[PDB]
Amino acid sequence: TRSVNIHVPVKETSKVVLECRGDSYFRHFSYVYWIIGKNKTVDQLPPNSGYRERIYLNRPRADLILTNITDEMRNEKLTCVLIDPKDPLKESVILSKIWNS
Amino acid sequence: TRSVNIHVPVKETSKVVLECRGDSYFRHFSYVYWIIGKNKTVDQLPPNSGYRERIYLRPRADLILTNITDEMRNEKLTCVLIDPKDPLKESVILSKIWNS
Amino acid sequence: YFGKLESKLSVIRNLNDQVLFIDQGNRPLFEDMTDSDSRDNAPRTIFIISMYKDSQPRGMAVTISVASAAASTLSSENKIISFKEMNPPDNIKDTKSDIIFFQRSVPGHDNKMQFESSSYEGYFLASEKERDLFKLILKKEELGDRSIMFTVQNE
Amino acid sequence: YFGKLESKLSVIRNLNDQVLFIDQGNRPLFEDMRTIFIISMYKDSQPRGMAVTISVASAASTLSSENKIISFKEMNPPDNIKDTKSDIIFFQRSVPGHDNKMQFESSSYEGYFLASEKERDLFKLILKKELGDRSIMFTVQN
């Protein structure tokens, strides 16, 4: 059993939190994190990008927190990745699609 | 200073969990819970409906769907915040989320 | 339909800071905080306010029962206030109940609460002086009626 | 880009159930049973598998595949690496059909893996390129 799952809020607020949870039977060696667009981890973004990541120190979890939200952020493809001893698993979301639904 | 927000998964899975969280400035007297369709709390559903509720003792209530049917996918699912003011509600229809 | 969610130990006091208690004759009365039960247990003044979910959300549905009592729950049966012999139930299959009140913040005063009878809309718990006593009564609603305003103190 | 996440104290054994250890000459060998390593996990801007460093817990010594050989650089696993490959980054992958076994591929030298090699009476940690090769399979004890 291996999977990665994103929970998103049904509506935008001033502080938006996306919750990424992985599920992996490789208990000591599994983790999740976010990639913004094609290839930027949150660590790589310029300061005040509006993105913050909270990686929880097997059900690995990483929350992505969006503040001062722009249209670029609303339309950005946001990916959560599960890493473990097997091929990486990804799930993604574009918020404007959820919020405009 | 008062809000209710539902977090939903971007894709359907065998077990689906919807997370409802309330935020109220009446911290000693606030709770959230789910209503299925017009007026059924989870307790009122026929047995083995596929809906379960977990109330956390910010208030939280998770709604857990299993053996999901098309009626469940299209059901209006409402989370209610109760506190000393008038109830505040937020709702979701999962099929809209998943087909976007 | 009301479904019980959680219960909280509470003390209630009118705007004169007189505390609600149950007396030796099973009557709900008010006494000066000065003279209120001072025991850590506080058996005669500690109430359980039990919060209920509602199939028809109209406000915060609650029962009020005596924490130290085997089975003593406040009731508005017949437009009068008594301690009915029962415990707050797991559920009530009804949209109104003589033991359910809606706990609502006072208009313009978030820190104060009023308790509206679900059985008798527009009727509220009130503190009323009768001879040397201060009684808990049910009275019809006049905005800013201060006799229906309470402070609800957690544990 | 590699960003450090979490580390784990680890005992590594080769295909013969011999434990990896560093000897007097600072050489990585295997023996039946200094033996405590740290496997540090990294997030990757280009997800390809589990990126890790291997360092000695009794530090600063970090395993390196520089120049297609095995060495231990005097350094700690870094907080980040601003590149998509590194002589100290290996991809840790489970063995097909054997979830309990791991292989470590050099990120710098694709197709090259950590391996155990018998050399006379010694068993050495080496880097090398035989499908199902057992010599590149390890178990990791946490």
Numbering used by the authors:
A (entry chain A): 24 to 80, 89 to 132
B (entry chain C): 24 to 80, 90 to 132
C (entry chain D): 1 to 141, 143 to 156
D (entry chain B): 1 to 33, 44 to 69, 71 to 140, 143 to 155
Manuscript excerpt for this entry:
IL18 is a pro-inflammatory cytokine belonging to the interleukin 1 superfamily and plays an important role in both innate and acquired immune responses by inducing interferon-γ (IFN-γ) production from T lymphocytes and macrophages while also enhancing the cytotoxicity of natural killer cells. Mammals and poxviruses encode homologous inhibitory proteins of IL18, named IL18BPs, which regulate IL18 activity and, in the case of the viral proteins, contribute to virulence. To understand the mechanism by which yatapoxvirus IL18BPs neutralize IL18, we solved the high-resolution crystal structure of the Yaba-Like Disease Virus (YLDV) IL18BP:IL18 complex. The structure of the complex shows that the YLDV-IL18BP forms a homo-dimer in a back-to-back fashion, with each protomer binding to a molecule of IL18, forming a hetero-tetramer complex with a stoichiometry of 2∶2.
Furthermore, a crystal from the complex of IL18 (8S) and a three-cysteine mutant of YLDV-IL18BP (ΔC21, C87S, C132S) diffracted to 1.75 Å. The two structures are essentially identical to each other with a root mean square deviation (r.m.s.d) of less than 0.4 Å, and the three mutated cysteines in YLDV-IL18BP are distant from the IL18 binding interface. Therefore, for discussion of protein:protein interactions between YLDV-IL18BP and IL18, we will mainly focus on the higher resolution structure of the mutant YLDV-IL18BP. In the triple-cysteine mutant YLDV-IL18BP:IL18 structure, the βE–βF loop is not visible in the electron density map, suggesting that C21–C87 SS bond stabilizes the local structure, particularly the βE–βF loop. However, the C21–C87 SS bond is not critical for the overall structure of YLDV-IL18BP or its binding with IL18 (shown later). The homo-dimer interface involves mainly βA, βB, βH and the C-terminal helix H3. It involves extensive hydrophobic interactions in the center (I29, H30, V31, P32 and V33 from βA, the aliphatic side chain of E122, V124 from βH and I129 from H3) flanked by hydrogen bonding and charge-charge interactions, burying approximately 1,700 Å2 and 1,465 Å2 solvent accessible surface area (ASA) for the wild-type complex and the triple-cysteine mutant complex, respectively. The lack of the C132-C132 SS bond in the triple-cysteine mutant complex caused the disorder of four residues at the C-terminus beyond S132, resulting in a slightly smaller ASA. However, the triple-cysteine mutant of YLDV-IL18BP displays nearly identical structure as the WT protein, and it exists as a dimer in solution judging by size exclusion chromatography and dynamic light scattering analysis (data not shown). Therefore, the dimerization is not solely dependent on the C132-C132 inter-chain SS bond.
